[PDB]
């Protein structure tokens, strides 16, 4: 669940892995941790995935409502200034490590919110279980004012470093660019090396020892 975030010369690139878990097993090999706050601002959070649902959808519509009240696009410091008002009252109830940021009237910001309520601006960060592995390769290859392609391979290596060097990670890696024009929901490096292919066994059709067949033909 390593989620990397950084800022390029004009946009912010996020990225994470699509593999949730329960502690000893794998939940699913594809669960897009990225989100859609609006057109010019995206979100990605770690921690418990249940509390992240009613913190993203709640923020998506509350920003959309505020976007329809005025006429301009929403600003990134308004939404972060609204989660803390709810996260403080749920200091031991709501727990989430959210990373979000997009283009607005100011530069491309990237805030990192803590479960207890702490939040501050950050030019590059990594949140999740294997966040330490993601921030490791990030601090060694982070130049200032890099191009979009210069940040695309960096966040790809930042997640790939958190894929092999961590247990609570895996699956594909999806990223997103949050430029002022539009967004991108690309899924590069979907590990197609294929070390070994499976062999599904389609069982034959004799019967399965069924005593009752209450078939119904409702339209």
């Amino acid at each position: 669940t390593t989620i990397c975030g950084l800022v390029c010369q004009n946009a912010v690139i996020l990225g994470a892995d699509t593999r949730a878990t329960e502690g000893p097993i794998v939940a699913d090999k594809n669960c897009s941790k990225l989100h859609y706050i609006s057109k010019n601002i995206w979100c990605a959070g770690a921690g418990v995935a249940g509390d992240l649902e009613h913190t993203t959808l709640w923020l998506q519509h509350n920003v959309e409502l505020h976007r329809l009240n005025t006429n301009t696009q929403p600003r990134v410091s308004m939404c972060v200034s609204r989660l803390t008002q709810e996260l403080f009252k749920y200091q031991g109830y709501k727990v989430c490590a959210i990373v979000l940021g997009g283009v607005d009237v100011n530069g491309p910001q990237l805030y990192g919110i803590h479960p207890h309520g702490s939040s501050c601006l950050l030019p590059f960060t990594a949140l999740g279980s294997g966040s330490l592995n993601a921030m490791a390769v990030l601090e060694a290859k982070y130049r200032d004012n890099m191009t979009i392609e210069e940040g695309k391979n960096l966040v790809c290596e930042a997640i790939c470093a958190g894929i092999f060097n961590d247990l609570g990670s895996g699956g594909n890696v999806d990223i997103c660019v949050i430029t002022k024009d539009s967004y991108q929901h690309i899924r590069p490096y979907k590990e197609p090396n294929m070390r070994l292919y499976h062999l599904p066994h389609p069982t034959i059709y004799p019967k399965g020892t069924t005593p009752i067949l209450s078939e119904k033909i409702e339209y």
Binding site: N69, T70, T72, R75, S77, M78, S81, R82, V105
Partner: protein, 246 residues
């Protein structure tokens, strides 16, 4: 006869709220005018400094109230209703910071004021607030904004508007004063809007009030870019701009 204007939430046979209609006449009866005009990257409010109809300190009586350090506004009408409207605005604009982080926008402030005004209209809780004002202020888009609100719900917004007892004898004058700068010369913007808009603003007030417009009976405020403070222009600069009519 006993017509249908007793309560505030009761419609008339033709369909007119007469308690609101009488409240607008309260503003026209206070005989206090004010002009507001937005030009390029600036906007100004011109007060009148008159008692709402000896030993009164004239520096205290005014019709300009800053809601925040970025959004200023004027007030007219009854002095009791206009004072409480500022407090119902200062406690609202500051509430926007505590509930949304960013500073409140000028257009959102007027619409949030009208929301509370409309609530007192449909319900017979309290009396209407016999007041009006011109909310001024720049936004994040680096553009000036001006908004006028009547005793009823209104978020009109004008590039140049007059509030007060002479709104029926000023549109024919403000249109010409605005035309004296839009379709005229219009060379450039040398950030000398004060010498371009306020001079073409005080001139509009002199065309409305037939007096000599004493500098010690008028105070303006600017919210232009590079300033951003709703600063009340000092007395010496007001008297200096009054001589520019020649």
């Amino acid at each position: 006869q006993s017509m249908y204007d007793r309560h505030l939430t009761i419609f008339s046979p033709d369909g007119n709220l007469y308690q609101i209609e009488y409240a607008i006449k309260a503003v026209k009866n206070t005989n206090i005018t004010s002009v507001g005009v937005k030009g390029e990257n600036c906007a100004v409010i011109i007060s009148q400094k008159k008692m709402a109809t000896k030993l009164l300190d004239y520096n205290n009586i005014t019709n300009i109230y800053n809601i925040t350090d970025e959004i200023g506004c004027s007030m007219v009408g009854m002095p009791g209703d206009c004072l409480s409207m500022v407090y119902k605005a200062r406690s609202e604009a500051s509430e926007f910071l505590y509930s949304n982080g960013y500073n409140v926008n000028a257009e959102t402030l007027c619409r949030n004021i009208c929301d509370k005004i409309q609530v007192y209209t449909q319900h017979a809780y309290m009396r209407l607030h016999a007041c009006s004002g011109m909310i001024i202020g720049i936004d994040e888009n680096n553009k000036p904004e001006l908004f006028k609100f009547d005793p009823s719900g209104f978020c009109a917004g004008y590039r140049a508007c007059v509030i007060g007892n002479k709104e029926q004898e000023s549109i024919s004058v403000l249109e010409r004063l605005l035309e004296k700068r839009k379709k005229k010369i219009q060379q450039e913007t040398i950030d000398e809007d004060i010498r371009n808009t306020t001079i073409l603003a005080i001139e509009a007030l002199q065309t409305i009030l037939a007096f000599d417009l004493k500098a010690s009976e008028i105070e303006v405020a600017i919210v232009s870019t590079k300033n951003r403070n709703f600063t009340q222009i000092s007395e010496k600069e007001i008297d200096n701009y009054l001589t520019y009519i020649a």
